């Protein structure tokens, strides 16, 4: 297949990296785990905005929260239902944050997905947010010199 994984894309988390300096903030890196979760090949999602994950049951109020975080160049953590290539639904405890360069400018966005079978609360929410925020901090490290 085209676009074999880089070293970074074999990290064992579901994540993407987008480039907001390109039109429509497209995916430029996507982990192996993300591509199995979502059942796409890497080549058919590179260069596309992540909105292909959305479908009829995806709450548009929650999508707007992501949109507004991107516009304000800030982080957000939300839960929403997303869809795979084959149409299967999954809950996504999702964390976005910008990655800044050495001048503080936003260079990339990082998105980390914790897939589940239900909306989580309380301890499962806390532990999931702990994991996706630690993961985002790790990808900030991993992506800084790309
Ligand atoms: C790094 C990154 C990852 C994203 N991951 C998801 C995701 O997992 N699920 C989702 O529904 N939208 C995701 N999005 C949000 C969409 O790409 C898009 O920003 C959102 O649909 C709002 O913009 P729109 O109104 O133009 O579609 C992600 C965006 C970025 C920048
Ligand atoms: Mg696109
Ligand atoms: Mg926010």
Author numbering: 401 to 546
From the article:
Light-oxygen-voltage (LOV) proteins form a sensory photoreceptor class that elicit a wide palette of physiological responses to blue light across archaea, bacteria, protists, fungi, and plants. Likely via a radical-pair mechanism, T1 reacts within microseconds to the signaling state, characterized by a covalent thioadduct between a highly conserved cysteine residue in the LOV photosensor and the C4a atom of the flavin isoalloxazine ring system. Thioadduct formation entails a hybridization change of the flavin C4a atom from sp2 to sp3 and concomitant protonation of the adjacent N5 atom. A highly conserved glutamine residue in strand Iβ is situated immediately adjacent to the flavin and has been identified as instrumental in reading out the flavin N5 position and eliciting the downstream transitions.
